Amino acid sequence: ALAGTIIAGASLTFQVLDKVLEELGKVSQKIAVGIDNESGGTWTALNAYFRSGTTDVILPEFVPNTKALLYSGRKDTGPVATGAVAAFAYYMSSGNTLGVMFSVPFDYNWYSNWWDVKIYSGKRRADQGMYEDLYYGNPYRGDNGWHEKNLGYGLRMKGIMTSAGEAKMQIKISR
């Protein structure tokens, strides 16, 4: 219920966010996927590609300035028994397309938590081609801590990763 929308990030906290993901349902799976909209350009979602169990909340089409938004999924009998996994892109006001990425590492103890983020300049819908840029384009690794880089389009992004239970990676974009 609370998922699908977030504030500027100045009032965001992991303590609230924990219980917020559980508002969706009382289950052994809580994922956090979102991007902090603080670049001064309204975003527009086009599609969402996933292999996860099924939907559970409505995906936010448009996003106001100096705000953010969350999402959740399900596993059920899809790629795993518990968690959620999707990769969707948002049309930026500059005519670029930010591609978010998330997964639940809580079912692959064999390795650490994979991560990635890129802005596809032009237009790219959510399909295999998006997830392919995450797994084949250039996959990254996140083992507890903040990280920032010059993405290559006009703005910068910062990605965070957290291991153990009640933990998840998020990505903030701004200028």
Curated annotation (Swiss-Prot):
InterPro entries: Actinoporin_PFT, Anemon_actinoporin-like, Cytolysin/lectin. Phosphocholine binds at S52, V85, S103, P105, Y131, Y135, Y136. One of its GO terms (biological process) is pore complex assembly. One of its GO terms (cellular component) is pore complex. A motif (Cell attachment site, crucial for protein stability) lies at residues 141-143. Residues 9-28 are annotated as: N-terminal region. Composed of a long N-terminal alpha-helix and a core region rich in beta-sheet structures. Before the pore formation, the alpha-helix binds the lipid membrane, partitions into the lipid-water interface and stabilizes the monomeric molecule on the membrane. Finally, it traverses the bilayer, thus forming the transmembrane pore. Pore-forming protein that forms cations-selective hydrophilic pores of around 1 nm and causes cardiac stimulation and cytolysis. Pore formation is a multi-step process that involves specific recognition of membrane sphingomyelin (but neither cholesterol nor phosphatidylcholine) using aromatic rich region and adjacent phosphocholine (POC) binding site, firm binding to the membrane (mainly driven by hydrophobic interactions) accompanied by the transfer of the N-terminal region to the lipid-water interface and finally pore formation after oligomerization of monomers. This is DELTA-stichotoxin-She4b. The lineage of its organism: Eukaryota, Metazoa, Cnidaria, Anthozoa, Hexacorallia.
